[PDB]
Amino acid sequence: SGINDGSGIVLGKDRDGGLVLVDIWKRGGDRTNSNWTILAKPGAGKSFTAKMLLLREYMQGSRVIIIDPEREYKEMCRKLGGVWINCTGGEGKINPLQVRLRPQSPLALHIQTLRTFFSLYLRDLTDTEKAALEDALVEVYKEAGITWDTDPRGVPNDKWPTVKELYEYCVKKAEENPETYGRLSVLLKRAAEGADSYLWAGPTAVEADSDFIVFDVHDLQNAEDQVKRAQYFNVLSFAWNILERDRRERTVLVVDEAWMLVDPQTPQAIAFLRDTSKRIRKYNGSLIVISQNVIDFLAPEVQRYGQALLDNPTYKLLLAQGEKDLEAITTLMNLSEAEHDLLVNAKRGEGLFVAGTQRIHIKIEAAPYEMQY
Amino acid sequence: GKSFTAKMLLLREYMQGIIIDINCTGGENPLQVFQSPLALHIQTLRTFFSLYLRDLTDTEKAALEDALVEVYKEAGITWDTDPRGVPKWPTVKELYEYCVKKAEENPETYGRLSVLLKRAAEGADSYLWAGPFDVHDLQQVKRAQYFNVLSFAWNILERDVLVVDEATPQAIAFLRDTSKRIRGSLIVIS
């Protein structure tokens, strides 16, 4: 049907070969936010399209922040002179316990964030254990000299406690409290000293202050699920903090392979993403969710958050879909049989573009000069 | 005539043989209390204090919990200790004192909290608790006292019939638990 805003960026071509041009910062009528949902099976063209969209928004002055488990955004980041953070290497160490603003006591809020972090990493923790874990975090902070009034802004990266201190506190308290701190301590040990210590046991090494930032969490794709999720959450909470502290307009936050964040037993992580999708409007930024495995967002435990997360954004790009994903999407977004079929037989980079209540056939393609990236 | 009906109800019930109205209003403690016993009670107290103090921020709601845990710690009881060993337990006074102690470095978090506990620690309300069932003497403070007694009266039976006359929403939730975890009967009039 054609979509052409005043100005904006070129997305691609419509069915009649005419230019689709979108201003994602528009407000008015059915343009209520600047968020995107990009969904498709692997190989469909998600990362290509997102690269185009991101490059063109960057060139118009948007800061870009990406969480990238695929290592799809490294080369772009290099071409643009942005900061590439390797989160599995020592230089990309992000300390979960370093207090940061979530989407009032900074410490109390951060402890609310840490409950989700540790529920993701340590699944199936008794309620006593959760209470005691929070007590332990409070005491470890207190020993590091940080209390309920302390402003995070002032504290140097190395003054924060780490999971090492938390582990040792729990072990010490497990002497006179073996029953409520025992298995807890043994579970923290893997992160403090064991095979996951390289992730979090040490001070934050990154000062990511740049208009193009990529958080590469690729070296985790063979890691266990709870590690994947806990680190994805930790990085997402850090990146959100970046957008909130130094708060220029039109910052685009990209969560690639967002399904990795979904956990039926800790739906709060996805709820955190949802909250991000709402609060980001307050800084005139954009949350872009990119993903396969759409059904993971629609499972009973998380659907309250997953549905809004996928469906509330003003802009959507649906490429070729997996069979289940296609049915769940067809239902969720009330696709017509024409639209459904469109998806069924869509070539790479082709599909449905949604802008508010407008939905049209689109084909995305790159200028030659955009190939370098 | 609900009081009459319930009166003869209780009278006939009496013919075969503990009720929120010993003038439990002062003289002759809401800090008296695998699964550590302390945590559960700390939950109880979330609702109790949410009843006494409205306007309570979430930061304050967490700082009060921390303070609680610490004051207990000073009393010498922690996570693994058996609450049948306590004759000795801390009281609202130690809590207030702690809060005042921490308010000098945490005025934003404990500042408007300590002054909130003054009246209950050694002021207008301290006769009720600051030391180690009828409440019509007190007719936010009444809802609070009523809830405290509800807890001390549910306990008796847990460690063993309850009339709940003229019966922070967690407060009404507590009810459903006691009224299901009966395994005496639970009478409610309103």
Coordinates of C-alpha atoms in Angstrom, one line a residue:
Chain A
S1 CA 0.0 0.0 0.0
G2 CA 3.1 2.2 0.4
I3 CA 4.5 4.0 3.4
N4 CA 6.4 7.2 3.0
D5 CA 6.9 9.6 5.9
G6 CA 8.1 13.2 5.5
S7 CA 11.7 12.2 5.9
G8 CA 13.3 9.4 7.8
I9 CA 15.4 6.6 6.5
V10 CA 14.9 4.3 3.5
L11 CA 13.8 0.9 4.5
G12 CA 13.4 -0.7 1.1
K13 CA 10.8 -1.1 -1.6
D14 CA 7.1 -1.9 -1.6
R15 CA 5.1 -4.2 -3.9
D16 CA 4.8 -1.5 -6.6
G17 CA 8.5 -0.8 -6.4
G18 CA 8.0 2.5 -4.6
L19 CA 10.3 3.7 -1.8
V20 CA 9.3 3.0 1.8
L21 CA 10.8 5.7 3.9
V22 CA 10.2 5.7 7.6
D23 CA 10.7 8.3 10.4
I24 CA 10.8 6.1 13.5
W25 CA 10.8 9.1 15.8
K26 CA 7.4 10.2 14.5
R27 CA 4.6 10.8 17.0
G28 CA 0.9 11.1 16.2
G29 CA -2.0 8.9 15.5
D30 CA -0.9 5.3 15.3
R31 CA 2.8 6.1 15.8
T32 CA 3.0 5.8 19.6
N33 CA 6.5 4.6 20.2
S34 CA 9.8 4.1 18.3
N35 CA 10.2 0.4 19.2
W36 CA 10.8 -2.4 16.7
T37 CA 10.1 -6.1 16.7
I38 CA 12.1 -8.1 14.1
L39 CA 11.2 -11.8 14.0
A40 CA 12.2 -14.6 11.7
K41 CA 13.7 -18.1 11.4
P42 CA 17.5 -18.3 11.1
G43 CA 19.0 -17.3 7.7
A44 CA 15.9 -15.3 6.9
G45 CA 17.7 -11.9 6.9
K46 CA 17.2 -10.5 10.4
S47 CA 20.8 -9.4 11.0
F48 CA 21.3 -8.0 7.5
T49 CA 18.1 -5.8 7.8
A50 CA 18.9 -4.7 11.3
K51 CA 22.4 -3.7 10.1
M52 CA 20.9 -1.6 7.3
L53 CA 18.4 0.1 9.7
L54 CA 21.0 0.6 12.4
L55 CA 23.6 2.1 10.0
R56 CA 21.0 4.5 8.5
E57 CA 19.8 5.6 11.9
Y58 CA 23.4 6.0 13.1
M59 CA 24.2 8.2 10.1
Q60 CA 21.4 10.6 11.2
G61 CA 22.8 10.9 14.6
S62 CA 21.4 8.0 16.7
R63 CA 23.7 6.4 19.3
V64 CA 23.6 2.6 18.9
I65 CA 23.9 0.0 21.7
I66 CA 23.7 -3.7 20.8
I67 CA 23.8 -7.0 22.7
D68 CA 25.1 -9.5 20.3
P69 CA 25.3 -13.3 21.0
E70 CA 25.9 -14.0 17.3
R71 CA 29.0 -11.9 16.7
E72 CA 27.1 -10.4 13.7
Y73 CA 27.9 -6.7 14.7
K74 CA 31.6 -6.8 15.2
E75 CA 32.7 -5.8 11.7
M76 CA 30.2 -2.9 11.6
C77 CA 31.4 -1.8 15.0
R78 CA 35.0 -1.8 13.6
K79 CA 34.1 0.2 10.5
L80 CA 32.4 2.8 12.6
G81 CA 35.2 3.0 15.2
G82 CA 32.8 2.0 18.0
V83 CA 33.6 0.1 21.2
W84 CA 33.5 -3.7 20.9
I85 CA 33.2 -5.3 24.3
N86 CA 34.1 -9.0 24.5
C87 CA 32.1 -10.0 27.6
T88 CA 33.7 -13.4 28.0
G89 CA 37.2 -12.0 28.0
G90 CA 38.8 -10.2 31.0
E91 CA 38.5 -6.8 29.3
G92 CA 34.7 -7.2 29.0
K93 CA 34.1 -8.1 32.6
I94 CA 30.9 -6.7 33.9
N95 CA 30.4 -7.0 37.6
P96 CA 26.8 -8.0 38.5
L97 CA 27.2 -6.4 42.0
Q98 CA 28.2 -3.0 40.7
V99 CA 25.1 -0.9 41.5
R100 CA 23.2 0.6 38.6
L101 CA 19.9 2.3 37.8
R102 CA 17.1 0.0 36.7
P103 CA 14.1 0.9 34.5
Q104 CA 14.7 5.8 46.2
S105 CA 17.8 3.8 47.4
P106 CA 20.2 2.8 44.6
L107 CA 21.3 -0.2 46.7
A108 CA 17.7 -1.4 47.4
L109 CA 16.8 -1.2 43.7
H110 CA 20.0 -2.9 42.6
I111 CA 19.2 -5.7 45.1
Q112 CA 15.8 -6.1 43.4
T113 CA 17.8 -6.5 40.1
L114 CA 20.1 -9.0 41.8
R115 CA 17.2 -11.2 42.9
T116 CA 16.4 -11.8 39.2
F117 CA 20.1 -12.2 38.3
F118 CA 20.6 -14.9 40.9
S119 CA 17.2 -16.6 40.2
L120 CA 18.4 -16.9 36.6
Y121 CA 21.8 -18.3 37.5
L122 CA 20.7 -20.5 40.5
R123 CA 17.4 -22.0 39.6
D124 CA 15.2 -23.6 42.3
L125 CA 16.4 -21.8 45.5
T126 CA 14.3 -22.2 48.7
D127 CA 12.7 -18.9 50.0
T128 CA 14.9 -19.0 53.1
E129 CA 17.9 -19.2 50.7
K130 CA 16.6 -16.2 48.8
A131 CA 16.1 -14.2 52.0
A132 CA 19.6 -15.1 53.3
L133 CA 21.1 -14.4 49.9
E134 CA 19.7 -10.8 50.1
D135 CA 21.0 -10.5 53.7
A136 CA 24.4 -11.6 52.5
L137 CA 24.4 -9.1 49.6
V138 CA 23.5 -6.4 52.1
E139 CA 26.4 -7.3 54.5
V140 CA 29.0 -7.7 51.7
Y141 CA 28.0 -4.2 50.4
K142 CA 28.2 -2.9 53.9
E143 CA 31.8 -4.3 54.3
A144 CA 32.7 -2.7 51.0
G145 CA 31.6 0.6 52.6
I146 CA 28.5 1.0 50.5
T147 CA 25.2 1.7 52.3
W148 CA 21.6 2.6 51.5
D149 CA 22.3 6.3 50.8
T150 CA 25.6 5.9 48.8
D151 CA 25.4 7.2 45.2
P152 CA 26.8 4.7 42.7
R153 CA 28.0 7.6 40.5
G154 CA 30.7 8.3 43.1
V155 CA 32.1 4.7 43.6
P156 CA 35.2 3.5 41.6
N157 CA 34.8 0.2 39.7
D158 CA 37.1 -1.6 42.2
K159 CA 35.4 -0.5 45.4
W160 CA 32.4 -2.7 44.6
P161 CA 32.1 -6.2 46.1
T162 CA 32.1 -9.1 43.7
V163 CA 30.6 -12.7 43.7
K164 CA 33.9 -13.7 45.4
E165 CA 33.2 -11.7 48.5
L166 CA 29.6 -12.9 48.5
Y167 CA 30.8 -16.5 48.2
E168 CA 33.3 -16.1 51.1
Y169 CA 30.6 -14.4 53.3
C170 CA 28.3 -17.3 52.7
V171 CA 30.9 -19.9 53.5
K172 CA 31.8 -18.1 56.7
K173 CA 28.2 -17.8 57.8
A174 CA 27.7 -21.5 56.9
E175 CA 29.7 -22.4 60.0
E176 CA 27.0 -21.3 62.5
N177 CA 24.2 -21.4 59.9
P178 CA 25.1 -24.6 57.9
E179 CA 21.4 -25.4 57.1
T180 CA 20.4 -22.1 55.4
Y181 CA 23.8 -21.1 53.9
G182 CA 25.4 -24.5 53.0
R183 CA 24.2 -25.5 49.5
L184 CA 24.0 -21.8 48.8
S185 CA 27.7 -21.4 49.4
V186 CA 28.6 -24.4 47.3
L187 CA 26.5 -23.0 44.5
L188 CA 28.2 -19.6 44.6
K189 CA 31.6 -21.2 44.5
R190 CA 31.4 -22.0 40.7
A191 CA 31.0 -18.3 40.0
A192 CA 33.5 -17.1 42.6
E193 CA 36.3 -19.6 41.9
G194 CA 35.0 -22.2 39.5
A195 CA 34.3 -22.6 35.8
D196 CA 32.1 -19.4 35.6
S197 CA 34.4 -17.2 37.5
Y198 CA 35.8 -15.6 34.4
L199 CA 32.4 -14.0 33.8
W200 CA 31.9 -12.0 37.0
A201 CA 34.6 -12.5 39.6
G202 CA 36.3 -9.1 39.4
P203 CA 35.7 -5.4 38.9
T204 CA 34.0 -4.0 35.8
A205 CA 36.6 -3.4 33.2
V206 CA 34.5 -1.5 30.7
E207 CA 33.9 2.3 30.5
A208 CA 31.7 2.1 27.4
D209 CA 31.2 5.7 26.4
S210 CA 30.7 5.9 22.7
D211 CA 28.0 6.4 20.1
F212 CA 28.4 2.8 18.8
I213 CA 28.7 0.1 21.5
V214 CA 28.5 -3.7 21.0
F215 CA 28.3 -6.2 23.8
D216 CA 29.4 -9.5 22.3
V217 CA 28.3 -12.5 24.3
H218 CA 29.0 -14.9 21.5
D219 CA 31.4 -17.1 23.4
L220 CA 28.5 -18.2 25.5
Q221 CA 26.3 -19.9 22.8
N222 CA 27.6 -23.3 24.0
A223 CA 27.3 -22.4 27.7
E224 CA 24.5 -23.9 29.9
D225 CA 21.1 -22.2 29.8
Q226 CA 21.3 -20.6 33.2
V227 CA 24.7 -19.0 32.3
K228 CA 23.4 -17.7 29.0
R229 CA 20.5 -16.1 30.7
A230 CA 22.2 -14.7 33.7
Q231 CA 24.9 -13.1 31.7
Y232 CA 22.4 -11.8 29.1
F233 CA 20.5 -10.2 31.9
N234 CA 23.6 -8.7 33.5
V235 CA 24.7 -7.2 30.2
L236 CA 21.2 -5.9 29.5
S237 CA 21.1 -4.2 32.9
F238 CA 24.5 -2.6 32.3
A239 CA 23.6 -1.4 28.8
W240 CA 20.3 0.0 30.1
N241 CA 22.3 1.8 32.7
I242 CA 24.4 3.4 30.0
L243 CA 21.4 4.7 28.2
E244 CA 19.9 6.1 31.4
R245 CA 22.9 7.9 32.9
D246 CA 24.2 9.8 29.8
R247 CA 20.8 10.3 28.3
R248 CA 20.9 11.8 24.8
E249 CA 17.9 11.4 22.5
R250 CA 17.3 8.8 19.8
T251 CA 19.6 6.1 21.3
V252 CA 18.7 2.8 19.8
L253 CA 19.1 -0.3 22.2
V254 CA 19.2 -3.6 20.3
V255 CA 18.6 -7.0 21.9
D256 CA 19.6 -9.7 19.4
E257 CA 18.5 -13.3 20.0
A258 CA 16.2 -12.0 22.8
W259 CA 14.7 -15.5 23.3
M260 CA 17.8 -16.3 25.3
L261 CA 16.5 -14.0 28.0
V262 CA 13.3 -16.0 28.5
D263 CA 13.0 -18.3 31.6
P264 CA 9.7 -19.9 32.7
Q265 CA 10.8 -19.9 36.3
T266 CA 12.2 -16.3 36.2
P267 CA 9.7 -14.3 34.1
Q268 CA 11.1 -11.2 35.7
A269 CA 13.9 -11.0 33.2
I270 CA 11.5 -10.6 30.3
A271 CA 9.4 -8.3 32.5
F272 CA 12.6 -6.2 32.9
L273 CA 12.9 -6.1 29.0
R274 CA 9.2 -5.0 28.9
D275 CA 9.8 -2.2 31.4
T276 CA 12.8 -1.2 29.3
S277 CA 10.5 -1.0 26.2
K278 CA 8.2 1.5 28.1
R279 CA 10.8 3.6 29.9
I280 CA 12.9 4.1 26.8
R281 CA 10.3 6.4 25.4
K282 CA 11.0 8.8 28.3
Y283 CA 14.5 9.4 26.7
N284 CA 13.1 9.4 23.2
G285 CA 15.1 6.2 22.4
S286 CA 14.2 3.0 20.7
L287 CA 14.2 -0.6 21.8
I288 CA 14.7 -3.1 19.0
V289 CA 14.0 -6.8 19.8
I290 CA 15.4 -9.2 17.3
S291 CA 14.7 -12.9 17.5
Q292 CA 13.8 -16.4 16.3
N293 CA 11.9 -18.8 18.5
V294 CA 8.8 -16.6 18.9
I295 CA 6.8 -19.2 20.8
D296 CA 9.3 -19.0 23.7
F297 CA 7.9 -15.5 24.4
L298 CA 4.3 -16.8 24.4
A299 CA 4.7 -19.7 26.9
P300 CA 2.1 -19.4 29.9
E301 CA 4.7 -18.3 32.5
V302 CA 6.0 -15.3 30.4
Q303 CA 3.3 -14.5 28.0
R304 CA 1.9 -11.6 30.1
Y305 CA 5.3 -9.9 29.4
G306 CA 6.2 -11.6 26.1
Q307 CA 3.0 -10.6 24.3
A308 CA 3.2 -6.9 25.1
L309 CA 7.0 -7.1 24.4
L310 CA 6.5 -8.4 20.8
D311 CA 3.2 -6.7 20.0
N312 CA 3.3 -3.1 21.5
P313 CA 6.1 -1.8 19.3
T314 CA 5.0 0.6 16.6
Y315 CA 7.3 -1.0 14.0
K316 CA 7.6 -4.7 13.1
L317 CA 9.5 -6.7 10.5
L318 CA 8.3 -10.2 9.9
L319 CA 10.4 -12.2 7.5
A320 CA 10.3 -15.9 6.7
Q321 CA 9.0 -17.8 9.7
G322 CA 9.2 -21.3 11.2
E323 CA 5.9 -23.3 11.1
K324 CA 5.0 -23.0 14.8
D325 CA 6.4 -19.4 15.0
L326 CA 4.2 -18.6 12.0
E327 CA 1.0 -19.9 13.6
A328 CA 1.7 -18.2 16.9
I329 CA 2.4 -14.9 15.0
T330 CA -0.6 -15.2 12.7
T331 CA -2.8 -15.5 15.8
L332 CA -1.0 -12.9 17.9
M333 CA -1.1 -10.2 15.3
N334 CA -4.2 -11.2 13.4
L335 CA -2.5 -11.8 10.1
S336 CA -4.8 -12.2 7.1
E337 CA -4.4 -15.3 4.9
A338 CA -2.7 -13.1 2.4
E339 CA -0.2 -11.9 5.0
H340 CA 0.2 -15.5 6.4
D341 CA 0.9 -16.8 2.9
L342 CA 3.2 -13.9 2.1
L343 CA 5.3 -15.1 5.1
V344 CA 5.0 -18.7 4.0
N345 CA 6.8 -18.0 0.6
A346 CA 9.1 -15.1 1.5
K347 CA 12.6 -15.0 0.1
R348 CA 15.5 -13.6 2.1
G349 CA 15.1 -9.9 3.1
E350 CA 11.5 -10.0 2.0
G351 CA 8.4 -9.9 4.3
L352 CA 5.9 -7.8 6.2
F353 CA 6.7 -4.3 7.4
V354 CA 4.4 -2.9 10.1
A355 CA 4.2 0.8 11.0
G356 CA 1.4 1.3 13.6
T357 CA -1.7 -0.2 12.0
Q358 CA -0.2 -0.2 8.5
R359 CA 1.1 -3.5 7.2
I360 CA 2.7 -4.0 3.8
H361 CA 4.8 -6.3 1.7
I362 CA 8.5 -5.1 1.8
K363 CA 11.8 -6.0 0.3
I364 CA 15.0 -4.7 2.0
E365 CA 18.2 -4.1 0.1
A366 CA 21.6 -2.5 0.6
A367 CA 23.3 0.3 -1.3
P368 CA 26.8 -0.9 -2.6
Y369 CA 28.6 1.5 -0.3
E370 CA 26.7 -0.1 2.6
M371 CA 28.3 -3.4 1.8
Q372 CA 31.6 -2.7 3.6
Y373 CA 29.6 -3.0 6.8
Chain B
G1 CA -28.2 -8.4 66.7
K2 CA -25.0 -10.1 65.5
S3 CA -23.6 -9.9 69.0
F4 CA -26.6 -11.7 70.4
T5 CA -26.7 -14.4 67.8
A6 CA -22.9 -14.9 68.1
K7 CA -23.3 -14.6 71.9
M8 CA -25.6 -17.6 72.2
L9 CA -23.6 -19.3 69.4
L10 CA -20.6 -19.1 71.7
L11 CA -22.7 -20.0 74.7
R12 CA -23.9 -23.2 73.1
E13 CA -20.4 -23.9 71.8
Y14 CA -19.2 -23.4 75.4
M15 CA -21.5 -26.3 76.5
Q16 CA -18.9 -28.5 74.9
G17 CA -15.4 -28.1 76.4
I18 CA -9.0 -17.3 72.9
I19 CA -10.9 -14.5 71.0
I20 CA -10.0 -11.1 69.6
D21 CA -12.4 -8.6 71.0
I22 CA -6.2 -10.4 79.7
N23 CA -6.3 -6.8 78.6
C24 CA -3.7 -7.2 75.9
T25 CA -3.0 -3.5 75.7
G26 CA 0.1 -3.1 77.8
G27 CA 1.7 -4.6 81.0
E28 CA 1.3 -8.2 81.9
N29 CA 6.0 -8.0 71.5
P30 CA 5.9 -8.1 67.6
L31 CA 9.6 -9.0 67.4
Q32 CA 8.9 -12.3 69.2
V33 CA 8.6 -14.9 66.4
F34 CA 14.6 -26.5 55.3
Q35 CA 13.1 -23.2 56.5
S36 CA 14.6 -20.8 59.0
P37 CA 11.9 -19.6 61.5
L38 CA 13.1 -16.0 61.3
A39 CA 12.4 -15.3 57.6
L40 CA 8.7 -16.3 57.8
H41 CA 8.2 -14.0 60.8
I42 CA 10.0 -11.2 58.9
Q43 CA 7.2 -11.7 56.3
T44 CA 4.6 -11.3 59.0
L45 CA 6.2 -8.1 60.0
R46 CA 6.2 -6.7 56.5
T47 CA 2.4 -6.6 56.8
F48 CA 2.4 -5.6 60.4
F49 CA 4.5 -2.5 59.9
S50 CA 2.8 -1.8 56.6
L51 CA -0.3 -1.6 58.8
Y52 CA 1.2 0.7 61.5
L53 CA 3.1 2.9 59.0
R54 CA 1.4 4.1 55.8
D55 CA 3.3 6.1 53.2
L56 CA 6.1 3.6 53.5
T57 CA 8.4 3.7 50.5
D58 CA 9.9 0.5 49.0
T59 CA 13.4 1.6 50.1
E60 CA 12.1 2.1 53.6
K61 CA 10.2 -1.2 53.3
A62 CA 13.6 -2.9 52.7
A63 CA 15.7 -0.9 55.2
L64 CA 13.3 -1.9 57.9
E65 CA 13.9 -5.6 56.9
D66 CA 17.6 -5.1 57.0
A67 CA 17.4 -3.4 60.4
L68 CA 15.2 -6.3 61.6
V69 CA 17.8 -8.9 60.6
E70 CA 20.6 -7.0 62.3
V71 CA 18.8 -6.3 65.6
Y72 CA 18.0 -10.0 65.7
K73 CA 21.7 -10.7 65.0
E74 CA 22.7 -8.6 68.0
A75 CA 20.2 -10.4 70.1
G76 CA 22.2 -13.5 69.2
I77 CA 19.7 -15.3 67.1
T78 CA 20.3 -16.0 63.4
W79 CA 19.1 -18.3 60.6
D80 CA 19.7 -21.8 62.1
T81 CA 18.7 -21.1 65.7
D82 CA 15.6 -22.7 67.4
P83 CA 13.0 -20.0 68.5
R84 CA 12.2 -22.2 71.5
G85 CA 15.5 -21.2 72.9
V86 CA 14.5 -17.6 73.3
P87 CA 13.0 -16.7 76.7
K88 CA 15.8 -12.4 75.6
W89 CA 14.4 -11.6 72.2
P90 CA 14.9 -8.2 70.8
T91 CA 12.0 -5.7 71.0
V92 CA 10.8 -2.7 69.0
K93 CA 13.1 -0.5 71.2
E94 CA 16.3 -2.2 69.9
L95 CA 14.9 -1.7 66.4
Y96 CA 14.3 2.0 66.9
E97 CA 17.7 2.4 68.5
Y98 CA 19.3 0.7 65.5
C99 CA 17.4 2.8 63.0
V100 CA 18.5 6.0 64.9
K101 CA 22.1 4.7 64.8
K102 CA 22.0 4.2 61.0
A103 CA 20.1 7.4 60.3
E104 CA 23.2 9.5 60.8
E105 CA 24.8 8.0 57.7
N106 CA 21.6 7.0 55.9
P107 CA 19.2 9.9 56.5
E108 CA 17.5 9.4 53.2
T109 CA 16.7 5.8 53.9
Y110 CA 16.3 5.6 57.7
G111 CA 15.8 9.3 58.4
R112 CA 12.0 9.5 58.0
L113 CA 11.8 6.0 59.4
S114 CA 13.4 6.4 62.8
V115 CA 11.2 9.4 63.7
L116 CA 8.4 7.1 62.5
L117 CA 9.4 4.5 65.0
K118 CA 10.0 7.0 67.9
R119 CA 6.3 7.1 68.9
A120 CA 6.2 3.3 68.9
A121 CA 9.5 2.8 70.6
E122 CA 9.2 5.1 73.6
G123 CA 6.3 7.3 72.7
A124 CA 2.5 7.2 72.4
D125 CA 2.4 3.6 71.4
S126 CA 5.3 2.0 73.2
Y127 CA 3.2 0.7 76.1
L128 CA 1.9 -1.9 73.7
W129 CA 5.2 -3.4 72.5
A130 CA 8.5 -1.9 73.8
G131 CA 8.8 -4.8 76.2
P132 CA 9.1 -8.6 76.1
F133 CA -7.6 -10.7 74.2
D134 CA -9.3 -7.3 74.3
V135 CA -8.3 -4.2 72.2
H136 CA -11.4 -2.0 72.4
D137 CA -9.2 0.3 74.5
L138 CA -7.8 1.5 71.1
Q139 CA -11.2 2.4 69.6
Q140 CA -3.7 2.9 61.5
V141 CA -2.8 2.1 65.2
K142 CA -5.9 0.0 65.7
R143 CA -5.6 -2.0 62.5
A144 CA -1.9 -2.6 63.5
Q145 CA -2.7 -3.8 67.1
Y146 CA -5.5 -5.9 65.8
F147 CA -3.2 -7.6 63.3
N148 CA -0.5 -8.1 65.9
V149 CA -3.0 -9.8 68.2
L150 CA -4.3 -11.8 65.3
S151 CA -0.8 -13.1 64.9
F152 CA -0.2 -13.8 68.6
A153 CA -3.6 -15.6 68.7
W154 CA -3.1 -17.6 65.5
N155 CA 0.2 -18.7 67.0
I156 CA -1.3 -20.0 70.3
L157 CA -3.4 -22.4 68.2
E158 CA -0.6 -23.3 65.8
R159 CA 1.4 -24.4 68.8
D160 CA -1.6 -26.4 70.1
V161 CA -11.3 -21.8 68.3
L162 CA -11.0 -18.1 67.4
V163 CA -13.6 -15.3 67.3
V164 CA -12.7 -12.5 64.9
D165 CA -15.2 -9.8 65.6
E166 CA -15.8 -6.7 63.5
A167 CA -13.3 -8.3 61.1
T168 CA -1.7 -3.0 53.3
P169 CA -4.1 -5.7 52.0
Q170 CA -1.6 -8.5 52.8
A171 CA -3.3 -8.1 56.2
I172 CA -6.6 -9.6 55.0
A173 CA -4.6 -12.2 53.1
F174 CA -3.0 -13.5 56.4
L175 CA -6.6 -14.3 57.3
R176 CA -7.2 -16.7 54.4
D177 CA -4.1 -18.6 55.5
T178 CA -5.2 -19.1 59.1
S179 CA -8.7 -19.8 57.9
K180 CA -7.4 -22.6 55.7
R181 CA -4.4 -23.8 57.8
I182 CA -7.0 -25.0 60.3
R183 CA -6.3 -28.7 60.8
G184 CA -10.7 -25.4 65.7
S185 CA -13.1 -23.2 63.7
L186 CA -12.7 -19.6 62.6
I187 CA -15.6 -17.2 63.3
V188 CA -15.8 -13.9 61.5
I189 CA -18.5 -11.2 62.1
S190 CA -18.9 -7.8 60.4

